[model samples]
Target: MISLIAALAVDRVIGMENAMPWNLPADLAWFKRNTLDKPVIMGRHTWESIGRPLPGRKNIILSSQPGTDDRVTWVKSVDEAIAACGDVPEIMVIGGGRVYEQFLPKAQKLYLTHIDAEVEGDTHFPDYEPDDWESVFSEFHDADAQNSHSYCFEILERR
Candidate 1:
């Protein structure tokens, strides 16, 4: 199974200047908790934004540039990324917009942190019809001194 995991603002923006626009520690912890030990597939820019391979997870990056390092497995396409994941029960598609759009149709589940605020951004999460999916679980949190805005941790599966 493939799962798309990301945090997006109400305007559907996912990143600005190649990084998350806001700092949400709880959301970061939620990401780590769900993605740990799973295979993570992302585009080259996402890999660069993250700076290094995430420990405890196999990092598969989609890139045309040919190179290999102990930290990551670079592949040429999304299919190659999935293939490289082998027998993993679920693969996490960590994003930059293009990668998320490419894999969205194939993803069986989505783990999203929906933030209430919007910021100017060049990258955005793809739009999906709410009726196409069902929210199986969700947790709501209000903004605090640490978090910039209210957000919901929502898990949805294709209906």
Candidate 2:
């Protein structure tokens, strides 16, 4: 399965100056819970923004530049990344706009967090057609001491 995961604000903002705008520990935890042990593919810029491969997941970076580490796999294209997934049941496309757009049409599932407020951002989530997907699950989370914003997690499956 190919899953697309992201957290976007009310204005569809996904990132600002190469970093996330909000501090939501719960959201980060949720991401880790879902993506652990899966092959996570991201664009070169996204990988650079993270500074290193994420632990507990196979990191596939889409780039023409060549390099590899124990935790990282370098691929020249999205197809190469997907192919590298091999026997993993699910491969996740973690974002930074362009990568998300490239995999959006191919994704079978979407794990999205909709933040309650709008914020300034340099990168944005691409618009998707709701009619093509059905909400399989949803949960609302209220802002707390650890989380700065209220958000809703929705899992959408392609129809």
Candidate 3:
């Protein structure tokens, strides 16, 4: 199975200047804990921003261009990315817009953080209607001290 994991904002903005615009320690921890030991597929730019393989997870970097860094499983296309994941029961699609668009149709589930606010952004998230998926579970995280960010965790399965 392939799943998408992302923190989205107004204009569906995910990153700017090649880095996430907001920092949520708790969210990061949650991402790390859940995706550890699984294959994490990301775009070349996102991988560049992160700089290294995540400690316990297999890292698959997608790019149509040629490049390399130790520890990254390089693939030139979505098909190659899927092939590189190599029988992992499940792989997580963790991304930037282009990567997400490539994998969205192939994903079985979505682990999305729907932020309450919106902002002006150059990059954007995919626009899928509620009817496009079935919400199996949801958890709302209101704005608080540790997370001045208001967001909700929505787990969806394609309809």
TM-scores of all models? 0.93, 0.91, 0.90
Runs of candidate 1 with Cα error greater than 4 angstroms are none
Using lDDT as the yardstick, the better of models 2 and 3 is 2
Clashes of each: 0, 0, 1
Tens-place lDDT per residue, model 2, 25-120, is 899898999999999998877787778889999899887778655568888988899999998788999986888999998899999999987787
Q: Which pairs clash inside model 1?
A: none
Q: Please give, for residues 1-159, the per-residue lDDT of candidate 1 as tens digits.
A: 999999888778887446666778888889999999999998877787888789999989887887656668988987889999999799999887889999999999999999988777757888889899999999999989988788899999998
Task: Report how far residue 75 has shifted in candidate 1, in Å.
Answer: 0.4
Where does candidate 1 have its weakest 10-residue lDDT segment? 14-23
Model 1: how far is 6 from its true place, Å? 0.8
- Per-model lDDT: 0.87, 0.86, 0.81
Off by over 4 Å in 2: 68-70
